Ligand code: DMA
Ligand code: DMA
Ligand code: DMA
Ligand code: DMA
């Protein structure tokens with residue numbers, strides 16, 4: 001399948017705009033040079049910025065204008081948190097990886113101690129950024145509650161815990177779904193949820209947007225599993241192609257994409273919702289072939 | 290002695306009360322039993338709870354009584370974050386310690402990976418707990434901003450980064466002071482600031498409360514340095530006894546206690562003065 005021209009236009013506008021203030025902001029909110037450099041290193045090493053892009057596309061789809069002085073820190077808090085999860089995931093105690101985002105991993109460059117602290121620093125800074133701007137306190141509190149719920153011991157960290165415990169266990173698919181929903185699903189759910197909070201989405205619209213979000217999070221993970229096989233064994237077993245075969249994984253991807261599209265078709269049509277729908281064109285459903 | 294009995298009586302009442310809902314609360318907020326066990330193990334292994342005790346003492350000195358439905362999760366959020374910091378500090382990549390709070394460290398019991406996640410889980414859960422009750426949103430947001438500022442890369446974590454970077458380095462005292470204010474001062478400053486927030490302290494009283502908070506946090510560190518040195522050469526040099534000798538360190542402790550007592554004198558009522566002053570009795574006995 002092909003990437004939608006809408007999505008190309010959207011990322012060309014937003015990726016550089018979201019990225020530009022990162023280095024100055026992280027440094028401004030730090031009181032240690034090396035810590036600042038370590039946190040920034042992992043954030044700037046690369047990244048599709050899928051999570052904050054989703055937040056912005058959600059906001060736009062609610063007719064709400066992104067204002068950098070009000071919205072940039074809260075939106076990019078999610079990217080700080082996502083980046084922290086990657087630093088800790090690569091650590092010697094965890095996955096013990098040498099490369100991340102095409103660069104040496106944080107601990108290889110700074111030491112395992114400083115890498116651990118860079119992760120802790122980014123996790124914490126995320127909550128400072130959610131509450132750093134002139135947004136209503138009700139909206140700030142809702143963001144914090146949502147992010148902590150998505151990121152913590154019922155969400156991303158629970159998923160990471162399950163991953164430790166499943167390292168040499170061939171999981172049934174039903175159990176793998178629960179793991180995925182915590183480990184990767186929850187921050188993608190939050191990405192959209194944050195846009196609903198910032199855009200003050202009427203309550204009646206929440207189910208359709210969040211069904212879209214959950215479907216996007218599931219498609220993301222199935223595609224990541226597919227990419228692990230096609231692109232450049234016991235943990236390969238706990239993947240969609242590991243459970244279902246490559247064709248079966250790709251059928252799951254196709255079904256999930258359609259399910260998310262169907263969810264959004266519940267809301268009134270608009271060009272901005274067409275932009276949001278177009279995020280599914282990130283997933284090439286012909287990559288298996 | 291009398292003042293010491295006052296502090297001990299406060300702790301005997303409040304520590305069991307504050308601890309009681311912890312196991313059930315952490316479990317309710319988790320979706321992995323092993324993770325919950327690892328988080329709960331380090332929180333319940335012990336701890337003087339000085340940080341949430343300071344919050345309670347501050348709020349009640351301002352005339353706001355502790356209400357469990359409103360206040361328990363937000364107050365104990367500070368203790369979850371404090372506990373996270375200890376777990377990560379003990380890790381093989383950091384201090385590589387075998388015992389914490391009278392028990393084997395988290396990574397000895399659960400492994401380094403799960404201990405790292407237990408710290409991450411506690412840090413994140415702290416922010417959920419701050420915003421978990423139905424306190425006014427202005428208060429919730431103020432607590433989150435204050436805690437993240439105290440705990441993050443300008444506060445605690447920055448203090449920890451300076452500690453890594455000074456492992457085999459003889460720091461000048463002026464640098465050591467900055468390191469201390471970040472590493473241990475910041476969360477103790479927050480302990481009192483959280484009480485000002487929850488107690489809706491009048492704005493003119495903030496300076497006296499926070500001068501007290503800073504003196505307490507400074508004294509806490511000097512006392513910790515003193516006790517470490519009493520109970521190789523690279524370890525001891527970046528401490529108060531290392532810089533000033535044990536006599537000078539003790540003189541610094543005594544002067545800092547007096548400064549904190551002086552700060553409290555600027556509060557408008559005797560009841561406020563006496564409530565927080567009992568915390569300096571902590572230094573009058575041994576651990
Ligand atoms: C499974 C998982 C969470 C992978 C990293 O996420 P990503 O593919 O969005 O990475 P990046 O942030 O590097 O684009
Ligand atoms: C929350 C998080 C960072 C998950 C990454 O999981 P993984 O180790 O399966 O993916 P990757 O190959 O990106 O490390
Ligand atoms: C240097 C430092 C922050 C030590 C632990 O503080 P603490 O003595 O308050 O620990 P506990 O929570 O075990 O009472
Ligand atoms: C924030 C934090 C946990 C600091 C620990 O300092 P330390 O390692 O000197 O104290 P301890 O002797 O309690 O590990």
Ligand SMILES: [Mg+2]
Pocket residue numbers: 089090095097
């Ligand atoms: Mg990994």
Ligand SMILES: [Mg+2]
Pocket residue numbers: 089095163
């Ligand atoms: Mg992993």
Ligand SMILES: [Mg+2]
Pocket residue numbers: 378379384386
């Ligand atoms: Mg230590």
Ligand SMILES: [Mg+2]
Pocket residue numbers: 378384452
């Ligand atoms: Mg240490």
